Amino acid sequence: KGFVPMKAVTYGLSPFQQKIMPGLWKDLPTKIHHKVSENWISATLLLGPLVGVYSYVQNYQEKEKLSHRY
């Protein structure tokens, strides 16, 4: 149910020997470039068909509004 026989060596430090907070604002320019050069075909597939449909509706409704005016 939960047993896999194994062989490894692990080392570990204490919580009160390390710096807890400063590893968040570490290299935020490098962190941002990694996320957007790897997830730019998943947002071109999420926002793409929505920006292109909203452009069609606003153009359709601006040509039947100027055709009813006398």
Binding site: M6, G12, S14, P15, F16
Partner: protein, 48 residues
């Protein structure tokens, strides 16, 4: 030796044992031995 009574035991225990860091070394079939945060937490009693 006989100048170590019950009050001397508690004062040296509070200096060396109570809420202090530990060191562990283990070997063998030790997948069911608890981890470091389990051991470090039990150096004090949140009940008294």
């Amino acid at each position: 030796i006989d100048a170590v009574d019950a009050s001397t035991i508690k004062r040296v225990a509070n200096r060396f044992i109570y809420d202090k860091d530990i060191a562990i070394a283990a070997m063998g079939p030790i997948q069911r031995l608890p981890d470091y945060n389990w051991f470090r937490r039990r150096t004090y009693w949140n009940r008294y």
